[PDB]
Design a protein around this nucleic acid. Sequence first.
RNA 1: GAGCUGUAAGCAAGCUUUGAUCCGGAGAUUUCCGAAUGGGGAAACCCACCACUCGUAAUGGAGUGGUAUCCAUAUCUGAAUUCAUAGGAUAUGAGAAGGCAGACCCGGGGAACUGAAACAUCUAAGUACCCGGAGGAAGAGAAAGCAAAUGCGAUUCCCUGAGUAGCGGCGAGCGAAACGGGAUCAGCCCAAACCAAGAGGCUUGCCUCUUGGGGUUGUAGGACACUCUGUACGGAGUUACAAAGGAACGAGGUAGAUGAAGAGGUCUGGAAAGGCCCGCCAUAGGAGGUAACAGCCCUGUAGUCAAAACUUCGUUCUCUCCUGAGUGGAUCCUGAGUACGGCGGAACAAUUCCGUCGGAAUCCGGGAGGACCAUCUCCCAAGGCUAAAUACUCCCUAGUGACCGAUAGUGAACCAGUACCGUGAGGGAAAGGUGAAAAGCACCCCGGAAGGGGAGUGAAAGAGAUCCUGAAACCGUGUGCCUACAAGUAGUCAGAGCCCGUUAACGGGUGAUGGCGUGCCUUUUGUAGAAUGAACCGGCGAGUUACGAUCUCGUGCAAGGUU
RNA 2: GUGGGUAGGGGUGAAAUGCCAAUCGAACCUGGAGAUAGCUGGUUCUCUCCGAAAUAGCUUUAGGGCUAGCCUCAAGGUAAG
RNA 3: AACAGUGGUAGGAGAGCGUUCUAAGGGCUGUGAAGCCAGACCGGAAGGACUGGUGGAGCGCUUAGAAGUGAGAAUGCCGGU
RNA 4: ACUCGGUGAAAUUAUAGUACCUGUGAAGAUGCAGGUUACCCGCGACAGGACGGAAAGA
Lengths: 50, 100, 44
Amino acid sequence: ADANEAVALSARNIPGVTVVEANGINVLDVVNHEKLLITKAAVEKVEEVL
Amino acid sequence: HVKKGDKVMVISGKDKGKQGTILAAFPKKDRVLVEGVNMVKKHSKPTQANPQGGISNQEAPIHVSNVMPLDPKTGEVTRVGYKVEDGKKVRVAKKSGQVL
Amino acid sequence: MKRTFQPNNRKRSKVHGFRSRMSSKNGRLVLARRRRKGRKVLSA
RNA sequence: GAGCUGUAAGCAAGCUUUGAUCCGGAGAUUUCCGAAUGGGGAAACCCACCACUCGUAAUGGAGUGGUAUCCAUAUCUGAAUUCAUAGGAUAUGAGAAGGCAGACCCGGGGAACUGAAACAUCUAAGUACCCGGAGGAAGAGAAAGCAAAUGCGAUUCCCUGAGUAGCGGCGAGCGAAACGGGAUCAGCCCAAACCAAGAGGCUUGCCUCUUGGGGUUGUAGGACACUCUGUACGGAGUUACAAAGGAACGAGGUAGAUGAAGAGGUCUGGAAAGGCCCGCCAUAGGAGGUAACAGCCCUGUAGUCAAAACUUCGUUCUCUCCUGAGUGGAUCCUGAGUACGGCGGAACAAUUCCGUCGGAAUCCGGGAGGACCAUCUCCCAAGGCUAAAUACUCCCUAGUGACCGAUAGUGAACCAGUACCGUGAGGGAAAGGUGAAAAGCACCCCGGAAGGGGAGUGAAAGAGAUCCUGAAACCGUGUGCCUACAAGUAGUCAGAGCCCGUUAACGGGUGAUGGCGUGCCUUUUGUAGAAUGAACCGGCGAGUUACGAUCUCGUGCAAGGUU
RNA sequence: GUGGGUAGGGGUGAAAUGCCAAUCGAACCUGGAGAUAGCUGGUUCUCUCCGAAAUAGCUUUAGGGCUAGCCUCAAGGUAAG
RNA sequence: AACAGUGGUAGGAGAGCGUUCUAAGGGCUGUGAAGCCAGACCGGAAGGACUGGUGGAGCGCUUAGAAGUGAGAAUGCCGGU
RNA sequence: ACUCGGUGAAAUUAUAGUACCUGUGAAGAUGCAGGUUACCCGCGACAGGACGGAAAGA
């Protein structure tokens, strides 16, 4: 939703994982990464922005 | 991480598995002379030193990352750490915790 | 430890020499240009 | 915190855990030339004077300081002129003198080619270039404005207005501004008029000389006269706001410290970081190295720290300094040869610049809104100072490329502005690769040597010093087929004989004889030509990018579409 | 012989090419400058479909340029040719 | 399927082959990569494989993207002969 | 000059197994047509062609 830091620090070293906040999603990092993990709050934020 | 006079063990190369004593160190090149390890045969001409001459049998320096010290209590290879005992920093053995 | 060319020709030094180059703004411009290029030898 | 005496060999002699080599801060020494400055001079050198010191019986010799010019401040004297003054002398001056960063900005001077198919102006262009001044930035700056409104209110920079208005042999072309949207955002001080003090001419008065208060203004303010209000416990500050020193805390910069986890087994191999079968760490899977492709081998990385000494910023204390608001408006001030006019060139009713003569007003006062004449609307000239937003980087630190990879990329990956060329200004190259490690060939043999053949090292010696790979031209040795009665752009189609045996295919090599057949490119009406070019081989070598115009196709939305 | 002087829209003092560093009817070097040229030469892989012109009118026109004529691609009219 | 057609310079239009790089997916390769040499193989062309030798460490396939994009001629420039 | 021993360049150069005659032909045929001659390879001379260069009229 709004860039919590514990999740950003973890998975920073895992070689295939990228963490972004709600207003950072864009076409390349959605198409490129096979799977999408999203929190229920980020779903609401993306829905209300668009 | 190792210096002259240390008991080490070779990890990589033809002599992998051998263990010996450091005789010299070359920190300007990260090379090190280990006894009984990486023996060469130099064809030396007759000259003032060694008047008759011949084919020698000496050691040659290997790379310092090919060798690791020995843990004092187990005898296996250990990584190096640095503690400060008495106003003096000492190399420690990560595997156990003993000095040198 | 250098190379010398005509170390006896006085007219050469009085025409293309250092002290003649330093005697007018144009010669000083010449010396500045040769220093900018990086020449080993300035003037005669 | 253990080796060290650079490259970089060798060969000697030494230093170092009572702590070297090395890295960072602060110091010391710093020959000679060079602005070069005691005088001279062909830069790297000659020759001096004064004071002190070393040395000689003395002359001769040596060492250490001072000795240029201009400017300023004085002090004396003081050419003409007596003082004065030019000057001279004397002193005191971290004054200024030159360099550069081929960049950025102020000022002065200032081309030509070109284009306009020609040339008449213009354009190129206030460009190139030259001269002077600087600063880390620089002029620019707080309305005698815009302009016409419900007005905004210093300057500068970006978007838009707009390639519009306009200027243009109105042709090429040149080319605005205001409004609106943003970045950054503070405005002040003096003169003048009045008060107090001393003097200096004047007779006191008067009147100027200075010093302290005073006051900075336009739907005028100040002086001035009178009211409250103060001189502090409040405010401000060295960045303009007059002016002006220290001390403590915090964060940086210039060395560094610490820092997780695999020798996993096994296979090939010269070597494992690779394959296969297993584990671990991760705020660390950036990067480089190591005998092949490493997270866990090394240096490291993430995260935490660390400074004796210099510095760069902040915060606080300390320090220093300091009144405002009213009523009036009797009487004075609000920036002198200026504002404006003529006279010429310059520039070019004309327009301005500069000179060339003139020459007001001044609050009931002026200046403006293209001219003049009146209405209304805004402002207050002839004094000064101001940061920020912007321009550029010779340099230093950390990084990044659908950038080059040794004829490329800097001219220069290598002792490159070098070697060479020129009298000089100046011009200006070529040249990277042993191997993981020198383990860089003891010894034997031929040879004067060079160079070879063994032996040996090495995974490789056909990796042996211009030593990775090594193509083509060019030069050779051996051999299968043909060739000494034959006339030819040299091949192509038909075709015996001989020799082979393939990516097995109506196979490969060579070819005695027969038919046909005037190279390639460019150019031209037309070439085989006595049109043109190429000795051969290799490398390099030419329709791009930016901004406008227009057309087609695709996508989105559609009378709306877009920032 | 030695040491010197005159510098480029100048010198060699008007009368002489005899020249000024292989340069002279205007020296040389760097820059404007990748100047300009209607003149000259060159422009690198392949196949498929279609396929010209060398004629008239102007241009101070001068082998250059513009308008018609002749080629190709696309969309419509359609069946006019 | 049935007809009809397929010479070509300037020129117009169409479809493709190769090269370097980048992105995604998939892979090769020390039991031997790129490069070099040879061959009697495959496609309509540009071209592409497969075997053997040398070489001794990197390369390629699919789909997109971007170009310093392909050489026999310039009295081209540099080297070798 | 020539032979022998030593050393050793340059202009030029599309490739080339490069005869002659009579014709044909964009300039003048070695390379086109028809015919006639000619065993293979050199060394020394000539100057005929030399589409050699000089020239120059113009």
